[PDB]
Nucleic acid binder design. Sequence first.
RNA 1: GGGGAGUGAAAUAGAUCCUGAAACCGCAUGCAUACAAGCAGUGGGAGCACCUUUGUGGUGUGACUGCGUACCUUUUGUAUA
RNA 2: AGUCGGCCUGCGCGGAAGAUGUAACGGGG
RNA 3: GUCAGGUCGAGUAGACCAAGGCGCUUGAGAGAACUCUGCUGAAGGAACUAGGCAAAAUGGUACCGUAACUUCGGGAGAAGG
RNA 4: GGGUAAGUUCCGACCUGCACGAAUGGCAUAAUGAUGGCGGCGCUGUCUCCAGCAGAGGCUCAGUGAAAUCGAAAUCGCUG
RNA 5: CAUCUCAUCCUGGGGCUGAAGCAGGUCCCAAGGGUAUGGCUGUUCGCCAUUUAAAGAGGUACGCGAGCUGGGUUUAGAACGUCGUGAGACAGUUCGGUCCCUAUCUACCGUGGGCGCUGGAAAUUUGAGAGGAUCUGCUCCUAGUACGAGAGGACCAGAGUGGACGAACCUCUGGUGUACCGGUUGUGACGCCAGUCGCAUCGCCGGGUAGCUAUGUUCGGAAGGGAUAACCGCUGAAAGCAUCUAAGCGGGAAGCCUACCUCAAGAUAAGAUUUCCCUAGGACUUUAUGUCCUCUAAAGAGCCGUUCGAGACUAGGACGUUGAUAGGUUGGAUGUGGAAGCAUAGUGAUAUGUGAAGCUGACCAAUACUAAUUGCUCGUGAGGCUUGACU
Lengths: 54, 117, 211, 119, 122
Amino acid sequence: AVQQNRKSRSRRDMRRSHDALTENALTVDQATGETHRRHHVTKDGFYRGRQLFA
Amino acid sequence: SGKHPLVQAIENSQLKTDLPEFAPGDTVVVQVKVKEGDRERLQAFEGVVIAKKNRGLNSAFTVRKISSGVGVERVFQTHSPVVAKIEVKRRGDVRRAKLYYLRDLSGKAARIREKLP
Amino acid sequence: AIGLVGRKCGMTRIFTDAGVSVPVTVIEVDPNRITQIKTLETDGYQAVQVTTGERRESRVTNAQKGHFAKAGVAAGRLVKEFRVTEAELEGREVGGTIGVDLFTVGQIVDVTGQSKGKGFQGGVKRWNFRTQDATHGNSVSHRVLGSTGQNQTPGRVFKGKKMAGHLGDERVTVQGLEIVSVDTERSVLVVKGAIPGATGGDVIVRPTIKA
Amino acid sequence: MRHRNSGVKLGRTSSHRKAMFQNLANSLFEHELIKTTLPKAKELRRVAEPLITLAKNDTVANRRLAFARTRNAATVGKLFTVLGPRYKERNGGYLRVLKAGFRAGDAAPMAYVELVDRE
Amino acid sequence: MIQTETMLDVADNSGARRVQCIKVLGGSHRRYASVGDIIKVTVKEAIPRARVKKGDVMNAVVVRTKFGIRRPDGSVIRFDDNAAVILNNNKAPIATRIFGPVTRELRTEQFMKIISLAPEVL
RNA sequence: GGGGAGUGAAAUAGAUCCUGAAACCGCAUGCAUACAAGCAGUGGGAGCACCUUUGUGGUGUGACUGCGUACCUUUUGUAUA
RNA sequence: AGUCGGCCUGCGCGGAAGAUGUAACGGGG
RNA sequence: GUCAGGUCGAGUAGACCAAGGCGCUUGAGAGAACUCUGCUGAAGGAACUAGGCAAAAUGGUACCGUAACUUCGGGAGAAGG
RNA sequence: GGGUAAGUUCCGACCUGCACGAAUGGCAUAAUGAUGGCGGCGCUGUCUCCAGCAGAGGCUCAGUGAAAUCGAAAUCGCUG
RNA sequence: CAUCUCAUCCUGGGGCUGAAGCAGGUCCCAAGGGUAUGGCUGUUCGCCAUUUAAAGAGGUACGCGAGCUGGGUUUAGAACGUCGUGAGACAGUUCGGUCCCUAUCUACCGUGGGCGCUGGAAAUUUGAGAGGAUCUGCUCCUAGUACGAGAGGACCAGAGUGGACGAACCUCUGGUGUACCGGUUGUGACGCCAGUCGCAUCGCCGGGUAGCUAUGUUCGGAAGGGAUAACCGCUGAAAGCAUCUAAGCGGGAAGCCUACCUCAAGAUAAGAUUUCCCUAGGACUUUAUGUCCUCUAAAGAGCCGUUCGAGACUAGGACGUUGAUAGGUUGGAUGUGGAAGCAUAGUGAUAUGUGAAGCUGACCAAUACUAAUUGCUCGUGAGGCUUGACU
Ligand SMILES: [Mg+2]
Ligand SMILES: [Mg+2]
Ligand SMILES: [Mg+2]
Ligand SMILES: [Mg+2]
Ligand SMILES: [Mg+2]
Ligand SMILES: [Mg+2]
Ligand SMILES: [Mg+2]
Ligand SMILES: [Mg+2]
Ligand SMILES: [Mg+2]
Ligand SMILES: [Mg+2]
Ligand SMILES: [Mg+2]
Ligand SMILES: [Mg+2]
Ligand SMILES: [Mg+2]
Ligand SMILES: [Mg+2]
Ligand SMILES: [Mg+2]
Ligand SMILES: [Mg+2]
Ligand SMILES: [Mg+2]
Ligand SMILES: [Mg+2]
Ligand SMILES: [Mg+2]
Ligand SMILES: [Mg+2]
Ligand SMILES: [Mg+2]
Ligand SMILES: [Mg+2]
Ligand SMILES: [Mg+2]
Ligand SMILES: [Mg+2]
Ligand SMILES: [Mg+2]
Ligand SMILES: [Mg+2]
Ligand SMILES: [Mg+2]
Ligand SMILES: [Mg+2]
Ligand SMILES: [Mg+2]
Ligand SMILES: [Mg+2]
Ligand SMILES: [Mg+2]
Ligand SMILES: [Mg+2]
Ligand SMILES: [Mg+2]
Ligand SMILES: [Mg+2]
Ligand SMILES: [Mg+2]
Ligand SMILES: [Mg+2]
Ligand SMILES: [Mg+2]
Ligand SMILES: [Mg+2]
């Protein structure tokens, strides 16, 4: 139910050794030069040479 | 036709070609091949079709009779060679596909209306 | 003993003339192509490496491209080895084919496959554990393991204790199956009984080792 | 296990789920472009495309079926006068789903659903 | 599928009406008795002037089950009741009349009489 | 909230404002560390890095190795679970 | 052609079965 | 403490609604074990267990019918149809 | 003795009452009791022996963010 | 939910017998597997009923309450008998009487990330080793034979069919199947009639496709080899004889090692085979798998996307346009059981026809209509030295 000894700072860091984040997959769109998330629409509404909300 | 074409081709080489058009509610006589050792003969099982399953070679039909006071249900595999012959005596006029409620009726209450052209 | 690699196509039934219904599994056998032969002087054991099926060229690495091109076979979807003997290696040669006619009707075989995966399972499903009473004052433990050991001697849990875990998805062999039919025009085996895995999974058919 | 099972749950009862997809389909047929969560958008295909397939042929029985599945008379009118005639010789694929980042308050992945030859 | 505590109709004229299975014989931890299996019973109901008394522990053979018998072609045969036939201490039927139908799984040397006396043998 | 500019002797004296310790939490550099069993030190000891020097020098680290079951209290007696 | 069986002693043999793992030389041997 | 509509209903019970008021201040996915809360379940039917615990079951209105015993009131909505 | 295949419980007896007994009342008693014991019909996942499914957690992601405990830990097994 | 011991309950192998046979008694070897269900009682036990091949004896905090229960016993209420003047008490009895903890470490069951493995990669593998499994009844035959006065009744060997247990699977038989079909009650709504939605446990009721599943279906514990235990020997001295033993040579068990199944090179001893990829220039010295700059970015891996009979997350499998990966569409199949509208018959409830119609999750097959991108990152530039062989 609870620890019998306080965990040392070294073991705590060794547990967090798997906590790192990853970057996302970003691509530069060619029809706008923009950078967007891959397979995602841009915030301007562009995706693969197609426009939403002109 | 819910199976792969290969399973279909295998199971279609052993379908029976001459089966009568019967529906649940019909009274039928099924001839059944019986082996009393070396002797081969036919036994008649006559009763009401209360269920009918359509699966090609996995088809089946359930027949209910009342023998000697005891109800008997027999499920027949349609394309089994032990089913020698199916004969439709009389056709019934039901409103569902499964007449399982007949399992809880007896005598006058278990009568089925006859279908007339 | 050399076997075949096929795919579980599905289950059916075969009616015998005497009226008996036989549950059967259909194995589809694309004719296996011999990719390699391993001998004592080069590998230290004798075996026949075979390929079956087809794999598109963009999914075939260059290593495997060259390995299949050395032989005279096209890339298959998997490569498998069969450990054989001599005099079971007479007319075998690279670029040859091992078809479905390697088996006879009535021959007893073993079928190896990958069983269906059930994910994470508890003691009841994975070890046939018994459940505790559903309602006689029983608290929040009906399908739990119960005791996992003893008191302070040994003071631990022994190895091999049956607990919850991942179930299925393992390699399983069913021995003692009978060949019901050998359709060489459809390239199909029809065996009596059930074989491990799902429809579309890879299965290895070998002559029975019990003999 | 879940082998070969189709359908979603989305943390709702089946009544709530049916109602919510009815609402979503009505909204999409009215605006032709909506923003929703990505799993909702992917399940909306199996709900909204059979309605268009139904609206291809204009019979009273078909319009009544469309009303039983939408319960919106304006949606039925639009299906059978505009959307049906539009996708007459298109064989499926009336919706287009495009991933659209994440919601702020939620970090839930989002998607736009639009009709194919809209605007 | 007869287990302990199952009540059975008696399908003969030996004097019992209802019996109750108290043991499935023929193996340790054996759970069920199908058609043709031998069973230890106790007599719950009996006719007044009979050879069998209420409270008698006897042998019986199962002749009808509601669960059903499988046939080699894939068929099932179900009955609307569970029924047994009382036997001797040496496992022989003590009846002269069999009531209701029976099945051909009883076609052995010991149960030949049951077959011969049945009104219908399915 | 901060960076400049400016004020001031001083702004890591900027208002959570004299000084600004420890526990505790970051980042940077050097060395060690992913075949090895325990109060974590101690005695020895290779290698590396940096300072310096022509050192039998200094500073950090510490492969490998012998020995080694915390402190207090209470007890006849405690690594004591 | 040596053989018989009585003692007294040195060192051995049997009598000698237990529960987590050799486990009654600390170990290798 | 007061008010309190509609349909059916003996009813202020209950189901669905009106006027009126709300969606209960984390969401999104996934759809493992296990836990909770439910629904269904072959054959059997208390073999469970300290114990039929819990569940299942019964259930309305009218009419017929209703035992022992009784303090003559009951029991009694006995039971059952 | 009865009840059950089988009854340390139950009911009816017997009387050898370790150690009942007459207003700290004795022996009965219709009705009544969320009262104790025992038996039966029905009914059942209570069970044989569990299977499937629904919702809520669990699990993953984003946000917020406890608790008891804690000499210090580079915190394996076995035999002693 | 276990795990061990053997002083063995069954099954296996033997000696002796007051062992004719069957069956026993007794001792030796043997721990592989197996080793009841109920009635009574809080019981453990015990008795009884009925089975079974057998219903072993023990250790494990009289194993196991941070796994469950709480019937007994041992809190507070109350009563009986008994003791006490009494408050109260018990060699006793009776009715009633709150069971907490979100798991840090070790252990264990699963499942990953990192790095290593003498350049890198994609596959396929060997097997040091580990785990699992290991039970047994009855019938027939040999043969009514051997044996026996009869009664009765075998060894050895063969065949079949069961129980329990385990595994896989879903063709069959069923269960479930709250996104499939239908019937029906109440109420509200869609302007209304008709039609058909919401809510009432999925309202209730009847069916039911896939998937999952057992009670369903198939399979398994086969045979063999080697070394042995008790035991039986052969030849044979010591010890002229005898003697299984000292030399020498044998037989011999469900036990041991293999054999069957699964895992397995983190087996740091890091194994093997096949195939694939990388062959640019300079400068500076710390003169060495040396440093920096320019050129290079391969085989392949990952991210990402469509997904899955794979799955907690992962991992794993398939595919990403030179594409059937998912959805949709088309066709089929299935399930339900006679749609709506109209007509006709009827006073109407309703019936019939049009038409086995309409609808039909998850299935099968086709089909680029929608979505799987034009990308990015990681991974380098022939892989130290010393000996020995061929060169
Ligand atoms: Mg740090
Ligand atoms: Mg509780
Ligand atoms: Mg509970
Ligand atoms: Mg699917
Ligand atoms: Mg949620
Ligand atoms: Mg509802
Ligand atoms: Mg300062
Ligand atoms: Mg300050
Ligand atoms: Mg190291
Ligand atoms: Mg003390
Ligand atoms: Mg002391
Ligand atoms: Mg000490
Ligand atoms: Mg201490
Ligand atoms: Mg400690
Ligand atoms: Mg109310
Ligand atoms: Mg049931
Ligand atoms: Mg039932
Ligand atoms: Mg009981
Ligand atoms: Mg019990
Ligand atoms: Mg109750
Ligand atoms: Mg209830
Ligand atoms: Mg009792
Ligand atoms: Mg008194
Ligand atoms: Mg007096
Ligand atoms: Mg008095
Ligand atoms: Mg009882
Ligand atoms: Mg350590
Ligand atoms: Mg220990
Ligand atoms: Mg022994
Ligand atoms: Mg007992
Ligand atoms: Mg204990
Ligand atoms: Mg108690
Ligand atoms: Mg099935
Ligand atoms: Mg099903
Ligand atoms: Mg209307
Ligand atoms: Mg409401
Ligand atoms: Mg379709
Ligand atoms: Mg309708």
